[PDB]
Design a protein around this ligand. Structure first.
Ligand SMILES: [Mg+2]
Ligand SMILES: [Mg+2]
Ligand SMILES: [Mg+2]
Ligand SMILES: [Mg+2]
Ligand SMILES: [Mg+2]
Ligand SMILES: [Mg+2]
Ligand SMILES: [Mg+2]
Ligand SMILES: [Mg+2]
Ligand SMILES: [Mg+2]
Ligand SMILES: [Mg+2]
Ligand SMILES: [Mg+2]
Ligand SMILES: [Mg+2]
Ligand SMILES: [Mg+2]
Ligand SMILES: [Mg+2]
Ligand SMILES: [Mg+2]
Ligand SMILES: [Mg+2]
Ligand SMILES: [Mg+2]
Ligand SMILES: [Mg+2]
Ligand SMILES: [Mg+2]
Ligand SMILES: [Mg+2]
Ligand SMILES: [Mg+2]
Ligand SMILES: [Mg+2]
Ligand SMILES: [Mg+2]
Ligand SMILES: [Mg+2]
Ligand SMILES: [Mg+2]
Ligand SMILES: [Mg+2]
Ligand SMILES: [Mg+2]
Ligand SMILES: [Mg+2]
Ligand SMILES: [Mg+2]
Ligand SMILES: [Mg+2]
Ligand SMILES: [Mg+2]
Ligand SMILES: [Mg+2]
Ligand SMILES: [Mg+2]
Ligand SMILES: [Mg+2]
Ligand SMILES: [Mg+2]
Ligand SMILES: [Mg+2]
Ligand SMILES: [Mg+2]
Ligand SMILES: [Mg+2]
Ligand SMILES: [Mg+2]
Ligand SMILES: [Mg+2]
Ligand SMILES: [Mg+2]
Ligand SMILES: [Mg+2]
Ligand SMILES: [Mg+2]
Ligand SMILES: [Mg+2]
Ligand SMILES: [Mg+2]
Ligand SMILES: [Mg+2]
Ligand SMILES: [Mg+2]
Ligand SMILES: [Mg+2]
Ligand SMILES: [Mg+2]
Ligand SMILES: [Mg+2]
Ligand SMILES: [Mg+2]
Ligand SMILES: [Mg+2]
Ligand SMILES: [Mg+2]
Ligand SMILES: [Mg+2]
Ligand SMILES: [Mg+2]
Ligand SMILES: [Mg+2]
Ligand SMILES: [Mg+2]
Ligand SMILES: [Mg+2]
Ligand SMILES: [Mg+2]
Ligand SMILES: [Mg+2]
Ligand SMILES: [Mg+2]
Ligand SMILES: [Mg+2]
Ligand SMILES: [Mg+2]
Ligand SMILES: [Mg+2]
Ligand SMILES: [Mg+2]
Ligand SMILES: [Mg+2]
Ligand SMILES: [Mg+2]
Ligand SMILES: [Mg+2]
Ligand SMILES: [Mg+2]
Ligand SMILES: [Mg+2]
Ligand SMILES: [Mg+2]
Ligand SMILES: [Mg+2]
Ligand SMILES: [Mg+2]
Ligand SMILES: [Mg+2]
Ligand SMILES: [Mg+2]
Ligand SMILES: [Mg+2]
Ligand SMILES: [Mg+2]
Ligand SMILES: [Mg+2]
Ligand SMILES: [Mg+2]
Ligand SMILES: [Mg+2]
Ligand SMILES: [Mg+2]
Ligand SMILES: [Mg+2]
Ligand SMILES: [Mg+2]
Ligand SMILES: [Mg+2]
Ligand SMILES: [Mg+2]
Ligand SMILES: [Mg+2]
Ligand SMILES: [Mg+2]
Ligand SMILES: [Mg+2]
Ligand SMILES: [Mg+2]
Ligand SMILES: [Mg+2]
Ligand SMILES: [Mg+2]
Ligand SMILES: [Mg+2]
Ligand SMILES: [Mg+2]
Ligand SMILES: [Mg+2]
Ligand SMILES: [Mg+2]
Ligand SMILES: [Mg+2]
Ligand SMILES: [Mg+2]
Ligand SMILES: [Mg+2]
Ligand SMILES: [Mg+2]
Ligand SMILES: [Mg+2]
Ligand SMILES: [Mg+2]
Ligand SMILES: [Mg+2]
Ligand SMILES: [Mg+2]
Ligand SMILES: [Mg+2]
Ligand SMILES: [Mg+2]
Ligand SMILES: [Mg+2]
Ligand SMILES: [Mg+2]
Ligand SMILES: [Mg+2]
Ligand SMILES: [Mg+2]
Ligand SMILES: [Mg+2]
Ligand SMILES: [Mg+2]
Ligand SMILES: [Mg+2]
Ligand SMILES: [Mg+2]
Ligand SMILES: [Mg+2]
Ligand SMILES: [Mg+2]
Ligand SMILES: [Mg+2]
Ligand SMILES: [Mg+2]
Ligand SMILES: [Mg+2]
Ligand SMILES: [Mg+2]
Ligand SMILES: [Mg+2]
Ligand SMILES: [Mg+2]
Ligand SMILES: [Mg+2]
Ligand SMILES: [Mg+2]
Ligand SMILES: [Mg+2]
Ligand SMILES: [Mg+2]
Ligand SMILES: [Mg+2]
Ligand SMILES: [Mg+2]
Ligand SMILES: [Mg+2]
Ligand SMILES: [Mg+2]
Ligand SMILES: [Mg+2]
Ligand SMILES: [Mg+2]
Ligand SMILES: [Mg+2]
Ligand SMILES: [Mg+2]
Ligand SMILES: [Mg+2]
Ligand SMILES: [Mg+2]
Ligand SMILES: [Mg+2]
Ligand SMILES: [Mg+2]
Ligand SMILES: [Mg+2]
Ligand SMILES: [Mg+2]
Ligand SMILES: [Mg+2]
Ligand SMILES: [Mg+2]
Ligand SMILES: [Mg+2]
Ligand SMILES: [Mg+2]
Ligand SMILES: [Mg+2]
Ligand SMILES: [Mg+2]
Ligand SMILES: [Mg+2]
Ligand SMILES: [Mg+2]
Ligand SMILES: [Mg+2]
Ligand SMILES: [Mg+2]
Ligand SMILES: [Mg+2]
Ligand SMILES: [Mg+2]
Ligand SMILES: [Mg+2]
Ligand SMILES: [Mg+2]
Ligand SMILES: [Mg+2]
Ligand SMILES: [Mg+2]
Ligand SMILES: [Mg+2]
Ligand SMILES: [Mg+2]
Ligand SMILES: [Mg+2]
Ligand SMILES: [Mg+2]
Ligand SMILES: [Mg+2]
Ligand SMILES: [Mg+2]
Ligand SMILES: [Mg+2]
Ligand SMILES: [Mg+2]
Ligand SMILES: [Mg+2]
Ligand SMILES: [Mg+2]
Ligand SMILES: [Mg+2]
Ligand SMILES: [Mg+2]
Ligand SMILES: [Mg+2]
Ligand SMILES: [Mg+2]
Ligand SMILES: [Mg+2]
Ligand SMILES: [Mg+2]
Ligand SMILES: [Mg+2]
Ligand SMILES: [Mg+2]
Ligand SMILES: [Mg+2]
Ligand SMILES: [Mg+2]
Ligand SMILES: [Mg+2]
Ligand SMILES: [Mg+2]
Ligand SMILES: [Mg+2]
Ligand SMILES: [Mg+2]
Ligand SMILES: [Mg+2]
Ligand SMILES: [Mg+2]
Ligand SMILES: [Mg+2]
Ligand SMILES: [Mg+2]
Ligand SMILES: [Mg+2]
Ligand SMILES: [Mg+2]
Ligand SMILES: [Mg+2]
Ligand SMILES: [Mg+2]
Ligand SMILES: [Mg+2]
Ligand SMILES: [Mg+2]
Ligand SMILES: [Mg+2]
Ligand SMILES: [Mg+2]
Ligand SMILES: [Mg+2]
Ligand SMILES: [Mg+2]
Ligand SMILES: [Mg+2]
Ligand SMILES: [Mg+2]
Ligand SMILES: [Mg+2]
Ligand SMILES: [Mg+2]
Ligand SMILES: [Mg+2]
Ligand SMILES: [Mg+2]
Ligand SMILES: [Mg+2]
Ligand SMILES: [Mg+2]
Ligand SMILES: [Mg+2]
Ligand SMILES: [Mg+2]
Ligand SMILES: [Mg+2]
Ligand SMILES: [Mg+2]
Ligand SMILES: [Zn+2]
Lengths: 64, 53
RNA sequence: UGAAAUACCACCCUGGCGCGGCUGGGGGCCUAACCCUCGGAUGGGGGGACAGCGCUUGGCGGGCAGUUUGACUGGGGCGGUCGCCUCCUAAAAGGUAACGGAGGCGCCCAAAGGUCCCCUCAGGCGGGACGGAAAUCCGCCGGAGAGCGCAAGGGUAGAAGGGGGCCUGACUGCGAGGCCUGCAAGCCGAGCAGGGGCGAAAGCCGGGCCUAGUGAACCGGUGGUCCCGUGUGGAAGGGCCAU
RNA sequence: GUGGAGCCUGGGAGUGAGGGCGCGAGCGAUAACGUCCGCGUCCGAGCGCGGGAACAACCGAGACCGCCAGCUAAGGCCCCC
RNA sequence: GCUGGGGCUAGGAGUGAAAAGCUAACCGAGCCCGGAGAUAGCUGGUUCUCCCCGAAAUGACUUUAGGGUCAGCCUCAGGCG
RNA sequence: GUAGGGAAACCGAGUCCGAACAGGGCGCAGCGGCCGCAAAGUCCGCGGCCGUGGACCCGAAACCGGGC
RNA sequence: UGGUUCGUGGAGCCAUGGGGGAAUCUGGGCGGACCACCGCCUAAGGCUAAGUACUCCGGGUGACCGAUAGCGCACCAGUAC
RNA sequence: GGGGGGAACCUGGGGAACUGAAACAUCUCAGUACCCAGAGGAGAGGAAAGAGAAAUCGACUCCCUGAGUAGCGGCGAGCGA
């Protein structure tokens, strides 16, 4: 039967207009007091997943 | 960080918002930290005060 | 006269008493629900509003049920080990294994941080009350063998070492370009803007001589924000920023 | 330097038990067809061919098919040959 | 005490002067049908021909270590030159 | 499929972070002589591989239900 | 407690085992806690074709099988054993 | 009038486990297998105390779509209007 959308992927990740997979940087959910303002600021941005991992995630989103 | 080396927040004294997290040794420093920091809401430097984390 | 001032009329406090409603407990009795029993049963006898049983609360509970009970390893078990830092092994780029050889981390500092100004060690010899191998003082020699919070290595006085003054850049908003690299992480970073610190200034400042001092998600807390709000306005509860 | 070279994008893998030898070390006993790395090589997949009495990995050499033709390699040239 | 006939007790259950004994010739949980083609990171097996290329047994991480994901190495198509 | 960016309100060849008119992230643009050629995209056929099913085939020891 | 996409979630709705327990239209249920506004609907009685499912049975037809195939059985088969 | 029977289909009352989550308990397999009661050529459902945002629609059943959407979920595996 028809493939199901993986909802863990759908909730964490976005496929961009050209087919990149963009996610939120990790590492700032907690334990942030002794992290420089540089670490916190930069971890607040989106990044582009490396191609091998992006190809896997995209197959999980067959209808995006 | 330990039982005597606590983490804490710095609260802008004018607009009340907590803008900074840091640490101190409460044996060496029993009194509240007071430090002039740049507050991005007031957009200027302000005395910030130690507050419970 | 005090703050208030009187006889009498209320209403209400105070705290208690006697009646009463309404129950909350307890003690005693009763009989009729309910239970037991009796050649007799629309009855008599016994128990009795308990016990049994229904719903719900917490508790004890291998009698039973489903399972869990790590890996490496000169076989397995036992012992040891599991992440991170330093040195060697490592064959002069990088990287490189063994239950190979040695150590250390799971902290700390409100200054042990920024800037400005100043200062220079250990050690050896001679000399000086108590005062010594070694306390403090004076001279001469002494490039770094001292110091740099803590392992080791690198680095270092033309300071990163010692002292003082003013300070909070132990910034907010970003970030060219790179190191490293399977991912995800880790690392370095000029410069631009906001508002500052020190300095006459050139300038420096996004913690600490550097390399360990750490933990991805999920779930939840707290402070902001005022973005969503299930017909509508709110609210409930979410999101976003910070921890 | 034109090579079954290199680079970019994408489709399909398989492999993640290696092993011997030479050199450089550690471990072991300046032991092991021992073990664990590094550089290389061959076997693996060339148990096809010549030599080494026989013999994956030593020496020689990379088998498209055929020939009762010639030259060589290592190794050999008394006989088995 | 032994024995005939007639009866009752069974599967997490019986029965057991206790051996986990016996419950229809294998009982630490009977047999049959069914869920059912359970599941098996294990072992085995996998069928015509010819042509070209042609690996790996490493690294990281892994309740991981004879299994995997990614990278490395092979192969095909397009492109670059 | 023809628009993307943002958690979203929303805005839109832009948008998000931001005080920024700063910087960055993710985005935005045919060949020939009106024509032919080609193409975004999409539809169908064919083929490789993937997902869901027992999913290349055979094989447990077992677990459960209902009966004997 | 169950049903629903809803596994306690902000948890409404529909169903109900236990306890409490109404009203007759100005009555009552719903629009996802709740309150207001605005709308929708009329619970606690019952019935109702057709369109849908299946294939013991009859027929029609196959880029379905052809006796190890096709039903377990082409034949005296749910038989012998 | 009832009783019993009928391949499969249907409704109601009860209701697993292997398995998947590369262990496992919530979760999944699944209200499936299966037992039982009842129905009939069908059964169930059915004439709004409906939907839910349309100032709207207008019983029920069934197919296509909406849609693997909205959501649910040790926010895992998966489930799924
Ligand atoms: Mg999720
Ligand atoms: Mg994060
Ligand atoms: Mg975390
Ligand atoms: Mg956070
Ligand atoms: Mg958060
Ligand atoms: Mg720090
Ligand atoms: Mg900082
Ligand atoms: Mg900070
Ligand atoms: Mg920020
Ligand atoms: Mg779609
Ligand atoms: Mg009495
Ligand atoms: Mg009595
Ligand atoms: Mg009595
Ligand atoms: Mg009682
Ligand atoms: Mg009773
Ligand atoms: Mg109660
Ligand atoms: Mg209890
Ligand atoms: Mg117990
Ligand atoms: Mg047990
Ligand atoms: Mg279970
Ligand atoms: Mg199980
Ligand atoms: Mg466990
Ligand atoms: Mg355990
Ligand atoms: Mg364990
Ligand atoms: Mg093991
Ligand atoms: Mg083991
Ligand atoms: Mg051993
Ligand atoms: Mg082993
Ligand atoms: Mg061995
Ligand atoms: Mg041995
Ligand atoms: Mg070993
Ligand atoms: Mg042990
Ligand atoms: Mg070295
Ligand atoms: Mg080295
Ligand atoms: Mg080296
Ligand atoms: Mg070298
Ligand atoms: Mg490199
Ligand atoms: Mg060991
Ligand atoms: Mg000072
Ligand atoms: Mg220091
Ligand atoms: Mg001296
Ligand atoms: Mg002296
Ligand atoms: Mg003296
Ligand atoms: Mg002296
Ligand atoms: Mg020194
Ligand atoms: Mg020390
Ligand atoms: Mg100083
Ligand atoms: Mg100073
Ligand atoms: Mg001043
Ligand atoms: Mg960069
Ligand atoms: Mg990287
Ligand atoms: Mg690191
Ligand atoms: Mg770090
Ligand atoms: Mg400035
Ligand atoms: Mg300035
Ligand atoms: Mg300035
Ligand atoms: Mg000045
Ligand atoms: Mg300046
Ligand atoms: Mg700077
Ligand atoms: Mg430090
Ligand atoms: Mg310093
Ligand atoms: Mg989880
Ligand atoms: Mg949360
Ligand atoms: Mg709003
Ligand atoms: Mg509003
Ligand atoms: Mg509303
Ligand atoms: Mg209002
Ligand atoms: Mg309000
Ligand atoms: Mg809110
Ligand atoms: Mg944060
Ligand atoms: Mg080639
Ligand atoms: Mg291809
Ligand atoms: Mg293929
Ligand atoms: Mg593979
Ligand atoms: Mg393999
Ligand atoms: Mg392996
Ligand atoms: Mg291996
Ligand atoms: Mg091996
Ligand atoms: Mg090995
Ligand atoms: Mg090896
Ligand atoms: Mg060797
Ligand atoms: Mg030699
Ligand atoms: Mg050697
Ligand atoms: Mg060595
Ligand atoms: Mg010897
Ligand atoms: Mg060997
Ligand atoms: Mg050897
Ligand atoms: Mg050796
Ligand atoms: Mg080798
Ligand atoms: Mg092999
Ligand atoms: Mg050879
Ligand atoms: Mg070869
Ligand atoms: Mg050979
Ligand atoms: Mg051979
Ligand atoms: Mg040979
Ligand atoms: Mg020979
Ligand atoms: Mg010979
Ligand atoms: Mg040989
Ligand atoms: Mg040999
Ligand atoms: Mg050849
Ligand atoms: Mg000749
Ligand atoms: Mg010769
Ligand atoms: Mg000879
Ligand atoms: Mg001769
Ligand atoms: Mg007898
Ligand atoms: Mg008998
Ligand atoms: Mg008998
Ligand atoms: Mg019996
Ligand atoms: Mg008995
Ligand atoms: Mg029985
Ligand atoms: Mg049994
Ligand atoms: Mg049984
Ligand atoms: Mg059993
Ligand atoms: Mg007996
Ligand atoms: Mg039998
Ligand atoms: Mg038996
Ligand atoms: Mg027997
Ligand atoms: Mg027996
Ligand atoms: Mg058993
Ligand atoms: Mg059966
Ligand atoms: Mg099954
Ligand atoms: Mg089987
Ligand atoms: Mg199955
Ligand atoms: Mg299993
Ligand atoms: Mg086959
Ligand atoms: Mg070839
Ligand atoms: Mg090799
Ligand atoms: Mg390996
Ligand atoms: Mg990894
Ligand atoms: Mg591990
Ligand atoms: Mg683990
Ligand atoms: Mg490992
Ligand atoms: Mg395995
Ligand atoms: Mg691969
Ligand atoms: Mg290559
Ligand atoms: Mg190649
Ligand atoms: Mg490729
Ligand atoms: Mg090509
Ligand atoms: Mg070429
Ligand atoms: Mg579209
Ligand atoms: Mg969006
Ligand atoms: Mg904003
Ligand atoms: Mg832009
Ligand atoms: Mg750009
Ligand atoms: Mg065309
Ligand atoms: Mg086309
Ligand atoms: Mg594929
Ligand atoms: Mg299946
Ligand atoms: Mg199967
Ligand atoms: Mg299959
Ligand atoms: Mg398949
Ligand atoms: Mg058995
Ligand atoms: Mg089980
Ligand atoms: Mg079991
Ligand atoms: Mg069992
Ligand atoms: Mg049974
Ligand atoms: Mg309820
Ligand atoms: Mg419920
Ligand atoms: Mg439920
Ligand atoms: Mg929830
Ligand atoms: Mg609900
Ligand atoms: Mg009720
Ligand atoms: Mg209710
Ligand atoms: Mg009304
Ligand atoms: Mg009313
Ligand atoms: Mg109601
Ligand atoms: Mg209600
Ligand atoms: Mg409604
Ligand atoms: Mg309501
Ligand atoms: Mg509402
Ligand atoms: Mg309505
Ligand atoms: Mg009709
Ligand atoms: Mg009908
Ligand atoms: Mg009909
Ligand atoms: Mg029909
Ligand atoms: Mg027929
Ligand atoms: Mg025929
Ligand atoms: Mg025959
Ligand atoms: Mg036959
Ligand atoms: Mg025949
Ligand atoms: Mg047959
Ligand atoms: Mg027949
Ligand atoms: Mg016969
Ligand atoms: Mg009947
Ligand atoms: Mg049912
Ligand atoms: Mg019934
Ligand atoms: Mg039920
Ligand atoms: Mg059961
Ligand atoms: Mg289960
Ligand atoms: Mg299954
Ligand atoms: Mg699965
Ligand atoms: Mg499992
Ligand atoms: Mg599994
Ligand atoms: Mg298991
Ligand atoms: Mg279920
Ligand atoms: Mg049923
Ligand atoms: Mg069935
Ligand atoms: Mg009946
Ligand atoms: Mg019947
Ligand atoms: Mg009909
Ligand atoms: Mg009917
Ligand atoms: Mg009806
Ligand atoms: Mg009606
Ligand atoms: Mg759609
Ligand atoms: Mg379900
Ligand atoms: Zn402020």
């Amino acid at each position: 039967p028809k493939m199901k959308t993986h909802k863990g992927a759908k909730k964490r990740v976005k496929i961009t207009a050209s087919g990149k997979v963009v996610a939120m940087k990790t590492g700032k959910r907690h334990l942030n007091w002794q992290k420089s303002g540089k670490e916190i600021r930069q971890k607040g941005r989106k990044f582009v997943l490396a191609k091998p991992e992006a190809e896997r995630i995209k197959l999980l989103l067959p209808y995006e | 960080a330990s039982e005597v080396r606590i983490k804490l927040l710095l609260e802008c004294t004018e607009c009340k918002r907590r803008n900074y997290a840091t640490e101190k040794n409460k044996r060496n420093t029993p009194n509240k930290l007071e430090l002039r920091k740049y507050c991005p809401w007031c957009r200027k430097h302000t005395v910030h005060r130690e507050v419970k984390i």
